[PDB]
Amino acid sequence: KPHVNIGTIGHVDHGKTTLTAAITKVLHDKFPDLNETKAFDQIDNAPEERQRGITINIAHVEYQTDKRHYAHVDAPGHADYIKNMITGAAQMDGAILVVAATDGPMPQTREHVLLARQVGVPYILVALNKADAVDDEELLELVEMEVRELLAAQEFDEDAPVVRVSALKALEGDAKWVASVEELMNAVDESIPDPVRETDKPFLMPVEDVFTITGRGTVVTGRVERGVINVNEEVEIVGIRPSTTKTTVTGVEMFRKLLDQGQAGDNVGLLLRGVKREDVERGQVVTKPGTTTPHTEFEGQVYILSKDEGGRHTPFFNNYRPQFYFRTTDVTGVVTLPEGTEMVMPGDNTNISVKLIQPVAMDEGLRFAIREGGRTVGAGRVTKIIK
Ligand SMILES: Nc1nc2c(ncn2[C@@H]2O[C@H](COP(=O)(O)OP(=O)(O)O)[C@@H](O)[C@H]2O)c(=O)[nH]1
Ligand SMILES: [Mg+2]
């Protein structure tokens, strides 16, 4: 019964919210287990979400098929999709592209799929909507060519399936189009690959602080993001200071217990053999040995907080010196703007190149904040690393 994060993406007036309403409905009349059929009113008039200091407008919805339980996310505004995806309100494990068969792919449709590659969304599949209105069959055929050629150039594939649906007629109970969105949810079931168990990910916990206890005890604290660790297994601290450390954890303890295994998500304290207190910093990470290494230069995709959200006032140029909150620490780096971009306004999303004065353990698809002395001015995700 795996849990999966998906969402509808596409142009405005193309019927993303309708299909989301149809999807939840089609499974609620067809399942006692599936949650309340949500109506267009409460999905379209989406609530307001504030995460990491950024304001969003996101509609969360849950439903489950017989193969997976899903966590669906929809937004009203296009910019909200820019916000959500880059700032991770939906660490999406799949995505449903919505292409209205009347218009076809529009700038956002390309912009959404493009941005899907920037944040590492593994799969995108297509829901050819509004087929209740298109007479011509060979027009529909071509509408599939433009898309499948949009998804092919953005490193996706022919493997991804296009499903002609009607988000309206299925929503209105028409058994011919109700079955159409039914096939979608089976494609959704099989096409999107199974998202890895956060337990089965390789071990990773960011360091939060460090103290001296007993005589030989130098505890490190943090909440495990990835994986689990067995007591006395070698770990690897990763580069707030320039070097790469290596030590064998000798005791893990959560609250009253002193476990031999800490799970992903647990607030845990790790006692270590072979380093002292002055060898560990916030933002350092205790990885499984050799799984991850710390880089210094990378290529990211960042969203800048706008005037209305308390974002930066002056636009910034190359050789911009902010801090980058990679995990539990603010590391200062310098910017180079992409060829063609001379200035970054508030509001603007952009690709970006960054050189850090520090080394930081990082992988692609890692959220980070951009701050002016603690005050966050933006956020983003790693897209490409260099050196
Ligand atoms: N005929 C038809 N109209 C649709 C369909 N899906 C959505 N619409 C229309 O599209 C309009 C906006 O739908 P909505 O889901 O809010 O679009 P989005 O949120 O921008 O993706 C509504 O007035 C619907 O009547 C469909 O499958 N068939
Ligand atoms: Mg919408």
Residue numbers in the entry: 10 to 396
Article, verbatim:
Each EF-Tu molecule was bound with a GDP and an Mg2+ ion. G-1 was referred to as the P-loop due to the conserved amino acid sequence like GX4GK(ST) from residues G19 to K25, which connected the β1 strand and α1 helix responsible for phosphate binding. Also, residues K25, T26, and T27, located on the α1 helix, forming hydrogen bonds with the α- and β-phosphate of GDP. Especially, residue D83 was bound with the Mg2+ ion through several water molecules. The GDP molecule interacted with residues D22, G24, K25, T26, T27, N138, D141, and A176 of EF-Tu, which were conserved in Mtb, E. coli, and T. thermophilus. Moreover, analyzing the electrostatic potential surface showed that GDP was bound in the pocket full of positive charges. D22, G24, K25, T26, T27, A176, and D141 of EF-Tu shifted from 2.8 Å to 5.5 Å upon conformational change, which could explain how EF-Ts help EF-Tu to dissociate with GDP and reactivate EF-Tu during the elongation cycle of protein translation.
EF-Tu is one of the most critical proteins in bacteria, as it is the only protein delivering aminoacyl-tRNA to the ribosome for polypeptide synthesis. EF-Ts functions as a guanine nucleotide exchange factor and catalyzes the reaction of EF-Tu from the inactive form (GDP-bound) to the active form (GTP-bound). The Mtb EF-Tu contains three domains, named Domain I (residues 1–200), II (residues 213–296), and III (residues 306–396). Here, we report the crystal structures of Mtb EF-Tu•EF-Ts and EF-Tu•GDP complexes, showing the molecular basis of EF-Tu’s representative recycling and inactive forms in protein translation.
